[PDB]
Amino acid sequence: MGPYLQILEQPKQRGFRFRYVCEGPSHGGLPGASSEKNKKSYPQVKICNYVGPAKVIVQLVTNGKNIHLHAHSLVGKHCEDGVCTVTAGPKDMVVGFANLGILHVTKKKVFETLEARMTEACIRGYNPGLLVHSDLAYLQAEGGGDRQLTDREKEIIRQAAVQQTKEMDLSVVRLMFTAFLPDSTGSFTRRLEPVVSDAIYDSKAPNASNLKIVRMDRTAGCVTGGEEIYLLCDKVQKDDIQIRFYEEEENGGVWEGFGDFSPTDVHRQFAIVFKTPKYKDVNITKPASVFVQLRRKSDLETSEPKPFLYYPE
Amino acid sequence: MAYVEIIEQPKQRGMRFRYKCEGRSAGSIPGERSTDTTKTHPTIKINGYTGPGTVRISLVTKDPPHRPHPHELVGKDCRDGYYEADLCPDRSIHSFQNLGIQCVKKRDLEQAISQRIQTNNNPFHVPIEEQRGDYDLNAVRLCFQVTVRDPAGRPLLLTPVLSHPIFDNRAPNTAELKICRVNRNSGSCLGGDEIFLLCDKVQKEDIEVYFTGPGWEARGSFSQADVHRQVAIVFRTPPYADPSLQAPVRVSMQLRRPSDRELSEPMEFQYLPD
DNA sequence: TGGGAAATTCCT
DNA sequence: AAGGAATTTCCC
Secondary structure, X not given: OOOOOEOOOOOOOOOOOOOEHHHOOOOOOOOOOOOOOOOOOOOEEEOOOOOOOOEEEEEEEOOXXXXXXXXXXXXXXXXXXXXXXXXXXXXXXXXEOOOOEEEEOOOOHHHHHHHHHHHHOOOOOOOOOOOOOOOOOOOOOOOOOOOOOOOOOHHHHHHHHHHHHHHOOOOOOEEEEEEEOOOOOOXXXXXXXXXXXXXXXXXXXXXXXXXXXXXXXXXXXEOOOOOEEEEEEOOOOHHHOEEEEEEEOOOOOEEEEEOEOOHHHEEOOOEEEEEOOOOOOOOOOOOEEEEEEEEOOOOOOEOOOXXXXXXXX | OOEEOOOOOEOOXXXXXXXXXXXXXXXOOOEOOOOOOOOOOOEEOEEOOOOOXXXXXXXXXXXXXXXXXXXOEEOOOOOOOOOOOOOOOOOOOEEOOOOEEEOOOOOOHHHHHHHHHOOOOOOOOOOOOOOOOOOOOOEEEEEEOOEEEOOOOOEEEOOOEEOOOEEOOOOOOOOOOOEEEEOOOOOEOOOOOEEXXXXXXXXXXXXXXXXXXXXXXXXXEOXXXXXXXXXXXXXXXXXOOOOOOOOOEEEEEEEEEOOOOEEOOOEEEEEEOO
């Protein structure tokens, strides 16, 4: 077709705490995979081999196996009904989505909120039965002033807004970008291949948080290992966490040690009492510096490495 | 007539109030001196009577103008919020093994209150306009509106006695005090040894590490920034009285909360010579 | 903006 | 029963 949707940048995938309804008014936003130190970045998208003016929309989609409408809604900017509508059709077709919020739905308000979401899109010209039920492959930018969803066809969105209520994952969400170009006069009928980005995983989600070692008891020990160490950390899950010591070797090589501790050794998801592992070579005569890090056994995600120092017996 | 005297006061701090959704019945109210093995139960002692009747265990507030506390006491024989059963004959000492202390959201506050008046729950009878405003949800005093019988079979309601304060151990500002474990338990009699203490939720703004010992009293040095997410305190040890001890001294250390002046179970700590 | 704590529903 | 954790709300 030529003009589609290119995501020139994306969020950080993990860092932002998707705020809810009763948490207060825009107490932040969705940054982007770009620390910079001075400035920052938001999810910026663009259109390649584009056309003239054009308006791109964005709807929160569900991760899962079968992409469908997500209960949560985007807020702020050109958003309305959880779907942001941006223009940016001058000369360039690069549109940046800054200061976007994500509202988390009640574990109860899912079904009810879902149903409606699957109507605000059906009636409108964007993602019809290609994000709800593949029986309404049409009814998108058909131009219809407002298609009356028959007690038959509206019952399709119902059944979809019923089964998908039990599959829904309230902690992870993905941004969907759908851009429509002009057609006949000026209305934006035709749409360019919608493209989903990565998952942004809620921060207030234990099994997704950003690991950190606030501080530790001692930062050194004997090569023999087996010395007790106290670690204070940011929220973690007793069953899915591990301390990992490591080091770089000549050319190719990386030593690896795990702290010995039972989940029972994790105090209120914020502390861990473990024992150091034996160092690569307990025969060393001079202190050897290694690095300690916190890692999640599941997503193998790590934390800021801390300079641990091993020394001779 | 006769008097009411509660034998097993409710464990000051232990139970954690449950919301309806919280699997409702999931445990009772432990007897004051309950233990991991020897479970006890709040037993009343109605002296001056030995026959049938009734008991209406209600839940008020901890302060004199004892208004009826909004959230319900659910479980066995608990209706409309309170509790209403009977009194065993060859029994002049009845206990209550089945009673959960359910909490009311703030959202459902005033409703619970109207449900307090619509049910005729008011042990000491406090004017409706008085029984309003703010309430202390994190604490209650179980009431006992038991009915006896004078020497003619006529029912008789005695003094509605109150139970020792019951604090929602789920409440950070009055939960129990526990020292799970500690970095080290020796340190020099000169003090200054950093300790890592893991504890049950504590409020940094109101907490301290108390070091007892015959004729000696001091506290560990730390700061708000040193308390980690309410479950850990990194503090420095206090100097011992004898800045040149000659032999190990086994002092005691416990968590102290100023506000309610309470202390955690003591934990052995031994100051070593210089 | 953040981001910790209190709230309160969820799950052995 | 006897607890530890999840995710919304509640504020500093």
